[PDB]
Structure 1
C-alpha cells in the first residue's frame, strides 16, 4: 500500500512514534518518505547481501529474517516479509527497537542525509 502523507502521520501517531525517543512525528514521516516513498511493499538489496524492507526500510543483517542474509541477527524476531504488510504495526514495533539501540535515527541513512536538521514539521503540515 502507498500511504498518504497525513494517513501515515496518523498511523505513526496512533502507534506511539510521535516523540518516541525524542523524535517528533515529522522526523518519522520524513524518514518514511525518503526511505520508501510511503510504499509498504518497498524492498531494496544492499552490497553486503542484506535487503531493506518496508515503509521504514528495515535491514535484514540486523533486524529481521529473510533467510538469505549472511550474519543476520534478527533482533526484532520477525520475518522480513511481515515488514511489508499494509498494517504498519510490525514495522513500528521494530523501528522502536532500532531507534533505541544507541545511534537514534542515524540508523536510517535517508533520515540522516535528507531529514536531519531540516524543518521536519513541514511533513505533518495540514494533518488533523
Structure 2
C-alpha cells in the first residue's frame, strides 16, 4: 500500500508515534517519505546481505527474520514480511523499539540525511489531525 502523506500521518499518530522519544510526527512522516516513498511494500538490499523492509525500512540484521541474513537478530520477534503489510501496526511497534535502541532516529539514514535539522512540521501541514 502506498499511503498518502496525511493518511500516513493520521495512522502514525493513532499508533502513538507523535512525540515518541521526543520525535514530533513530522519527523516520522519525513522519514517514511525518504526511506520508502510511503510504500509499505518497499524492500532494499544492504551490502552486508541484510535487507530493509517496509514503510520505515527496518533492517533484518537486527529487527526481523527474513531467513537469509545469517547470524542476525530478530529483536522485534517478527518475520520481515510482516513489515510489508498494509497494516502498519508491526512497523510502528518495531520502530518504537528501534528509536529506543540508543541512537534515536539516527537509525534511519534517510531521516538523518534528509529530515534531521529541517522544518519537519511541513510534512504534516494541511493535515486534519
CA distance in 2, matches of 1:23, 1:100: 11
Q: CA deviation at 1:18?
A: 0.1
> For the aligned residues, what is the CA RMSD?
0.4
- 1:50 matched to 2:45? The reply is no
Q: What SS does the aligned partner of 1:52 have?
A: strand
CA distance in 2, matches of 1:28, 1:71: 29
The C-alpha deviation readout for 1:45-95, integer Å capped at 9, x for no partner, is 011000000000000001000000022110100000000000100000000
Instruction: Return the TM-score normalized by structure 1.
Output: 0.99
Q: What SS does the aligned partner of 2:92 have?
A: helix
Q: CA deviation at 1:97?
A: 0.1
Q: What SS does the aligned partner of 1:44 have?
A: strand
CA distance in 2, matches of 1:21, 1:34: 20
CA distance in 2, matches of 1:22, 1:91: 18
Where in structure 1 do 4 or more consecutive aligned residues deviate above 4 Å? none
Instruction: Return the TM-score normalized by structure 2.
Output: 0.99
CA distance in 1, matches of 2:72, 2:109: 19
Q: CA deviation at 1:123?
A: 0.1
Q: Give the number of equivalent residue pairs.
A: 128
CA distance in 2, matches of 1:26, 1:36: 15
Gaps of 5+ in 1: none
Q: What SS does the aligned partner of 2:52 have?
A: strand
Aligned residue runs from structure 1 range 1-128, under 5 A: 1-128=1-128
